[PDB]
Amino acid sequence: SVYDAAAQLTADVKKDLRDSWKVIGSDKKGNGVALMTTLFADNQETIGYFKRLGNVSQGMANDKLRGHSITLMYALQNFIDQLDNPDDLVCVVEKFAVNHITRKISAAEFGKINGPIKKVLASKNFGDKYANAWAKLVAVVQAAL
Amino acid sequence: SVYDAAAQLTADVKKDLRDSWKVIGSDKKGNGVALMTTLFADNQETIGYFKRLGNVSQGMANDKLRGHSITLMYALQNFIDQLDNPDDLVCVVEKFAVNHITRKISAAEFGKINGPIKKVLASKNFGDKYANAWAKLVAVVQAAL
């Protein structure tokens, strides 16, 4: 149930998501690439999914990876903006899942993003509390996969 | 070239884009659905492309349509935010075009969105001058299709 998962986003969780997002969301290009490069470093077994992006080890220098990384941050921007209305949050998460489902990305696969997020947050001085909050948002997406 | 197209975005054009976007982009759910509904109303032939969305005549009530309309607006949010750096605008546009090319959407088909955009702008009192500005942004994407 995606709705039950969204119900886990309590007042405190939503507050922490916004506070952290105010910082990491201000530099979508920088933090977006950092998130992807950390994913490829910690989970090399996922690189096979981004073969269209060429040599992802190039990081910021790869124009295809940079385009994907920036675009990725706008999906998160969308989720944060829908935190007030769970009905809209759910419909945008299901729309989001469509393409990832077509790519055969399973919930187990997607959950691997939690590590990179925790590390990116940490580099910006955000601790456990914030990593946990984001883990709850990702859970909503997983329930839709 | 997508890069050459991005050159049409002069200072005055980028100004009208941001000014108009501050308004139509302030209500993504509302205007986003207006864009889609207007598209289906004036260009019935495009309804076949969105069969996944189910019954698009339901408008706001259709969760799938609402989810798509809100997500669509964040693609435009992305373009607007990259206006000052042609390099970033280009890579995000090419990324964006990937899925639309796989769906067989030609540059001419995509251009059909100009009509709906014009009307949505007009509903907020933004005249031909702004419509033309947006037509140039859409042209950038067309250069990649």
Ligand code: HEM
């Ligand atoms: C917070 C996590 C994530 C976000 C916000 C995110 C966001 C996005 C967005 C916005 C797109 C572009 C639109 C589309 O094609 O659907 C996309 C594409 C893609 N995503 Fe996700 N994604 C995330 C995690 C993942 C993970 C963990 C995988 C795989 C293990 C994955 C694999 C893909 C692939 C392969 C593409 C296509 C890239 C390309 O060819 O350009 N995504 N994702």
Ligand code: HEM
């Ligand atoms: C202002 C122009 C437009 C924007 C910003 C836009 C944005 C988007 C976005 C963000 C997606 C979701 C990610 C993905 O590509 O899978 C999408 C999907 C799609 N777009 Fe575009 N689009 C635009 C115009 C059009 C037009 C004119 C057509 C065709 C007449 C079109 C056909 C499609 C289709 C068929 C989908 C998949 C919908 C589904 O089955 O869920 N788009 N578009």
